[PDB]
Design a protein around this ligand. Structure first.
Ligand SMILES: COc1cccc2[nH]c(C(=O)N[C@@H](CC(C)C)C(=O)N[C@@H](C[C@@H]3CCNC3=O)C(=O)c3nc4ccccc4s3)cc12
Ligand SMILES: COc1cccc2[nH]c(C(=O)N[C@@H](CC(C)C)C(=O)N[C@@H](C[C@@H]3CCNC3=O)C(=O)c3nc4ccccc4s3)cc12
Lengths: 298, 299
């Protein structure tokens, strides 16, 4: 089992650069609109606590340099939506895929196309942590790179990159400019909530183990959702939601193991440890494979 | 620090479907030629001991059905190169990138674009193991998927997929159709030679751990190159050459840790273990990052 990204070509065709003064970041060109982080308009001395409304009043369409490679796209309008700038340009992107903007939940995974100066550098799979950070790999100049899923040729954009916390994890917004978690776009040290283990993904991993014949950990007990959630919190595990139970449905049907029966199996693992026995060849439970990732790889 | 693949768009525009009779697998369309595994011509009976040149002489151009998306491309010729079939078509691929065919060395990495029915499914990073297998993720119908590196808009193709061993690892060929390793395109259960760990890559990765602010495994000791190699061979690690030491130089300079000092740290980890501690989130020593991979990501 491995972390697999989606093929990135449909997103590569949409990356451009956006420059104000000497500040260049990545933007996303869809139809005739370019989306990018609003702090492209910030000077170094306004970053501590910028006045974005006041900074944007001073800007005009002709202050924005938008380039696809070396080709300039003329800007004919601009607006701000939360923490993203929307630049209307005079050309509709001929490589625009079928697409949606979506806001994901903690535990969901997505692919990140890491870009520098509008040019793709690499692709990898990330999971949104319960404290709304991602464990990414981003350098200076990566802001504006996006994360996405692809379903039947439709790209669902879910992440745009804005910042690196002092602990080395990353934070950003959806494509409507709303941050995931309690962060703000200022040059300031911010801290995330203490992280927790993604319970729904650990259960998906147990299902994958069963599918491959590794099932020693199954037991004859069951539990209520509420009883399991109260126990999980004592072990720094996320509580399960109704949506979590539902996305485990296909794996539950495939193995014949009820979701609440698998919860009682995980609950025994939590109170007693693994006893040096492994699951799928590991002493550690994996929590960054979603139920969809598991059926993707089968 | 994550396992990072190359962006796959330049390869996506080359993937097609090839069908013969009831068999379907993926092909690579470059200019006017489609490359695919030759056993697309095999029927089920043929699989065990196919005489390929004999089976190929009995095929006509019109037996090959090549599809790019919804469009069919007409085969105007065909030839075989080792385990790869080369189908000449009447249309040139306009999305053909600049490219080259290369044979990689054990321990080098590449990106794999997994495809089914000519459609890209996922992309991830693999290393050519010392025993010439790869620990990939491939299901039925993945044959013909390719592995590649990218350098300044030039795509270097190095792997085409052919089989899964009983142990679950994978085997394939370069784009001239020669297998990596002692494998053969027969429907038989085949075993690989005993694998070993890629030592220069483990060292590159420990350096990455330092760059990302993790130092719990460093120590005050030092070792000679030969004495490290004796312990490494004991633990089934490949020997470390002076070429590898030089290669790690940029990394050593960056962190101020001499190569043989980092070797002393790896020696202790091999002799004492990790004691349930973690490195970059892993409980095991990672060996599928090359020194180039580390430099490219960290800077
Ligand atoms: C004293 O303040 C700190 C204390 C402790 C940790 C800290 N982290 C950050 C922080 O992240 N700032 C944001 C920017 C702010 C405005 C969101 C930022 O630099 N984003 C980067 C990606 C970063 C860089 C390293 N790899 C990460 O992913 C990015 O690309 C952008 N660059 C610029 C350059 C100019 C103008 C806009 C942008 S946006 C500040 C900070
Ligand atoms: C008693 O035989 C075994 C015993 C123990 C383990 C074994 N493994 C294999 C084995 O791998 N065979 C090759 C095929 C051989 C000819 C190279 C094969 O199936 N390749 C797959 C990719 C495979 C499938 C599962 N995931 C992997 O990646 C592929 O796509 C192709 N399918 C066909 C189907 C028909 C015709 C051509 C192709 S080519 C056989 C075998």
């Amino acid at each position: 089992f491995r972390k697999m990204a989606f093929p990135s070509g449909k997103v590569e065709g949409c990356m451009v650069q956006v420059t104000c003064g000497t500040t260049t970041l990545n933007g996303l060109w869809l139809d005739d609109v370019v989306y990018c982080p609003r702090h492209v308009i910030c000077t170094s001395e306004d970053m501590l606590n910028p006045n974005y409304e006041d900074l944007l009043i001073r800007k005009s369409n002709h202050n924005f340099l938008v380039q696809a490679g070396n080709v300039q796209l003329r800007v004919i309008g601009h607006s701000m939506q939360n923490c993203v700038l929307k630049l209307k340009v005079d050309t509709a992107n001929p490589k625009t895929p079928k697409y949606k903007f979506v806001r994901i939940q903690p535990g969901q995974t997505f692919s990140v196309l890491a870009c520098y100066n509008g040019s793709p550098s690499g692709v990898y799979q990330c999971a949104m942590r319960p404290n709304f950070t991602i464990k990414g790999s981003f350098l200076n100049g990566s802001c504006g790179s996006v994360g996405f899923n692809i379903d039947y040729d439709c790209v669902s954009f879910c992440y745009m990159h804005h910042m690196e916390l002092p602990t080395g994890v990353h934070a950003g917004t959806d494509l409507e400019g709303n941050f995931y978690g309690p962060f703000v776009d200022r040059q300031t040290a911010q801290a995330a909530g203490t992280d927790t283990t993604i319970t729904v993904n650990v259960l998906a991993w147990l299902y994958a183990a069963v599918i491959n014949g590794d099932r020693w950990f199954l037991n004859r007990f069951t539990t209520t959702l509420n009883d399991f959630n109260l126990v999980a919190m004592k072990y720094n595990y996320e509580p399960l939601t109704q949506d979590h139970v539902d996305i485990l449905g296909p794996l539950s049907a495939q193995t014949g193991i009820a979701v609440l029966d698998m919860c009682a199996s995980l609950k025994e693992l939590l109170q007693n440890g693994m006893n040096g026995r492994t699951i799928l060849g590991s002493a550690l439970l994996e929590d960054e494979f979603t139920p969809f990732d598991v059926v993707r790889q089968c």
